[PDB]
């Protein structure tokens, strides 16, 4: 009876994930609708793009709060401390599980610079002990605390692999962040229900008809003979420590930001009479400095979270299609050539704002992750460095007299998991960016790079979810 | 320090790989140069093909039992049973270390059904274990004994992963074959030493002219616009099912062989007085029984185990040469195309010969695994699949008014994956062998078909290494 328990679980959680994600798609592109209506008059542009995220992060706001305060935060540290041995059995209920779910679809409908992988692990834990307790009138036997709590395991197991739709990837990166001592047992469990979720999810976007034909979401269409050559081993190893050193920063910079609000007393009084303010606040801020025709056009605001990654994992080589664009169409990849500013402007400039920009709303009141950000940030990162190692050199790197340029979006990749395993100081990242894009032709860049990432990382800071379970 | 204990471990153990992997070639090519000498008389090269892989083994199990009978058998129930507590300061010895490398090189060497999975575990074992020493020898600094046990389980991890060239993987079957519970923290340290002996390997193989540059060991050219249509499956459900049973049969044969062999009084005189005769026994009965032109037509044995599985991995459908041997060169695949049986029947024939001739050599008293056996047994049976497919649908499934025809060697990878799981009781093979093969396209066909057979054989068999310490 538990691998029809695992099966349930699976089924529901993938359900869940689907209508989240049709539901964020729905809210970014009545969002572009709105503000390509109404290009009229600039002003009447801003004030849509300025009000429309911040009634979004407000109504989250103000709907948590009223309906469960607890649904705040990531959700990730709240379980380690579960598995750890306190029971908040008050902390999965119901009413917590609707806040969740509607709040963070809003907080991520609203294009601010959030993630979902803690979000979507707390709501498949809840979803998992709704479950049982709906399976409880059946039989007792389900109430033993132990198979609960290694039910509630496979459960994190299952969020974070439907969060990536990656299986093994999510399994592993479950293990690493959510327990310390793990059984062979629950990981079998796991996998096993991960499977299944990830069959359902394959089965429903053949039933769906979503795109034009039955592709990838994050298509990787690099060249399989030499993805990368011995040479470019220094700029991976260079990226792996950059990284970890950010991701160090990242988390840093997240508790100081936390300990600053925390601490002023004036400043959290007058937050604390109008609590509502701050979200307003801080998106007020981000969509003012995201405005796609105010300054916008130096970080291509024009493009969602998702849009972004994609773009940025293209196999183009952005720096010498001066010369090989004349019979090919214009790229979404423009956004990224403003008219005025060269591609290594805007990447550096997306970078050192999108890098507290993301810190800062990490914090805000609203149920959020933070995978999705750093993970962009680091394919950002690993995009400039490729961009800057073809520019260095623009035949390529000798080999056997055969030219082969060098592929910026195996660097991106590369930089990204390094980044988010920096920061969540985790070796599973490697695993999961495989199974997103597909290809696995840069298995020995994105391990030294992960590596080293995290090694630095321990060297320097605790992860972001130590971080958030020793402030909180 | 534990960095750089890692790091030369790895390097350490990436050099007997590469050292031990040439032995083992240049005694096929020998051998195949030998045979093809003698093409003129049939009596010389039968008695070449019967003697040398007979004196092979002979010399094998002479060397092991004069030198160290402890080295004999696979090699990693024995390490079950060290990190269960029980630790022999007998297997760790460099004259046991000495035995193994020479002993499982010359069963390696003679084409015998053998793998390299437990034995080159066990040396991974040996070789932390001596520079642990050499390094304590300079120092008194070493003498508390908590250092060695998590040493010990990261140089399994470093060896099955250097036995696969598949660091995440080999890491993952380690994990789940030399343990129950296991820290994160040794499976962050096994990852580190199994990435840098992975770049020790490549670089090894840019610097030896061996291969071009860094690749796969198994390259594939799966297309990756529909690698597999959801009508497929079920068949890969099939085949999964299938692999389960196989697995728990091959367990259960192998172990009824033992018993056998050593219950009965008269075989086990005929042991104490003539121990060396059961091995030059069976290796003359499988080498006569794959004759090239005598029975070994009919089981491709001209092929060694590693050209086999390339052969089997192709990405050519052999049902349909019949129609399309107009555009491509002759392949190797026509080894599987006798003139007078079809390729079903050499494929039923090779499968239903190999089990046994797989389950009875993994007994021999010499240094053996039983991995890569299982895993060719696995591809050959996904390939009949495959075939057996394209064969019932000619045409393929045409989808929107286009055709996409079968590659059934997506379906002999499945099968390959599916039944090794099913035999170890382990569902990281799915990872190993999108190490191996390189491509990512058929997770989901792998993945259920891992479940399932895992599944199965659990229902029914214990695991072979659980086999092997209850029968030890
Ligand atoms: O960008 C959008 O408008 C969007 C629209 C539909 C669905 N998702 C979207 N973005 C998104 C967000 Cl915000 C958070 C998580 C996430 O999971 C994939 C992923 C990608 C990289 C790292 C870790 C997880 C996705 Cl795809
Ligand atoms: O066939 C040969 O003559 C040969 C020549 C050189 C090197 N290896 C050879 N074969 C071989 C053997 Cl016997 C055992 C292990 C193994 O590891 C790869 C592997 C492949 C599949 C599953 C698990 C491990 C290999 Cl490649």
């Given amino acids: 009876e538990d691998?029809?328990?695992?099966?349930?679980?699976?089924?529901?959680?993938?359900?869940v994930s689907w209508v989240m994600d049709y539901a964020i798609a729905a809210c970014l592109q009545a969002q572009q609708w709105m503000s390509r209506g109404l290009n009229t008059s600039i002003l009447l542009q801003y004030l849509a793009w300025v009000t429309y995220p911040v009634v979004l992060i407000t109504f989250s706001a103000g709907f948590t709060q009223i309906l469960a305060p607890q649904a705040v935060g990531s959700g990730i540290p709240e379980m380690k401390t579960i598995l750890r041995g306190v029971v908040l059995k008050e902390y999965l209920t119901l009413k917590t599980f609707?806040?969740?779910?509607?709040?963070?679809?809003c907080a991520l409908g609203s294009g601010m610079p959030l993630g979902k992988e803690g979000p979507f692990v707390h709501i498949a834990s809840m979803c998992a002990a709704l479950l049982s307790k709906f399976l409880s009138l059946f039989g007792g036997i389900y109430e033993n605390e132990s198979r609960n709590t290694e039910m509630l395991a496979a459960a994190c197991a299952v969020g974070v692999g439907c969060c990536f739709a990656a299986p093994i990837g999510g399994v592993l990166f479950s293990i690493e962040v959510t327990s310390t001592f793990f059984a062979v047992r629950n990981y079998w469990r796991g996998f096993f229900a991960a499977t299944f979720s990830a069959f359902i999810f394959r089965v429903l976007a053949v039933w769906n008809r979503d795109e034009e034909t039955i592709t990838a979401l994050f298509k990787t269409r690099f060249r399989l003979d030499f993805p990368f050559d011995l040479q470019e081993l220094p700029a991976f190893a260079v990226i792996g420590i950059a990284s970890g050193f950010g991701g160090a920063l990242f988390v840093y910079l997240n508790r100081k930001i936390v300990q600053v609000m925390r601490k002023q007393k004036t400043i959290n009084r007058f937050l604390m009479?109008?609590?509502l303010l701050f979200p307003a606040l801080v998106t007020l801020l981000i969509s003012t400095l995201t405005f796609p025709?105010?300054?916008?056009?130096?970080?291509?605001?024009?493009?969602?979270?998702?849009?972004?990654?994609?773009?940025?994992?293209?196999?183009?080589?952005?720096?010498?299609?001066?010369?090989?664009?004349?019979?090919?169409?214009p790229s979404t990849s423009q956004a990224w050539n403003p008219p005025r500013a060269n591609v290594f402007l805007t990447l550096v400039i997306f970078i050192l704002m999108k890098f507290w920009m993301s810190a800062l709303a990490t914090?805000?009141?609203?149920?959020?992750?933070?995978?999705?950000?750093?993970?962009?940030?680091?394919?950002?990162?690993?995009?400039?460095?490729?961009?800057?190692?073809?520019?260095?050199?623009?035949?390529?790197?000798?080999?056997?007299?055969?030219?082969?340029?060098?592929?910026?979006?195996?660097?991106?990749?590369?930089?990204?998991?390094?980044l988010a395993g920096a920061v969540t100081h985790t070796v599973s990242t490697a695993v999961i960016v495989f199974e997103l894009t597909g290809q696995i032709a840069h298995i020995l860049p994105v391990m030294i790079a992960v590596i080293l990432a995290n090694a630095v990382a321990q060297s320097l800071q605790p992860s972001l979810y130590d971080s958030i379970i020793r402030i909180k």
Same sequence: chains 1, 2.
């Fill in 363 to 418: 914090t805000i009141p609203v149920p959020c992750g933070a995978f999705m950000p750093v993970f962009v940030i680091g394919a950002a990162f690993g995009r400039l460095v490729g961009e800057s190692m073809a520019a260095w050199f623009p035949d390529g790197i000798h080999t056997d007299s055969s030219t082969y340029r060098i592929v910026p979006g195996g660097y991106a990749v590369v930089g990204a998991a390094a």
């Fill in 293 to 329: 025709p105010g300054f916008g056009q130096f970080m291509a605001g024009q493009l969602s979270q998702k849009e972004t990654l994609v773009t940025l994992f293209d196999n183009r080589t952005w720096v010498r299609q001066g010369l090989v664009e004349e019979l090919e169409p």
């Fill in 3 to 15: 691998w029809i328990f695992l099966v349930l679980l699976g089924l529901l959680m993938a359900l």
């Fill in 273 to 275: 009479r109008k609590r």
């Fill in 98 to 105: 609707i806040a969740k779910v509607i709040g963070l679809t």
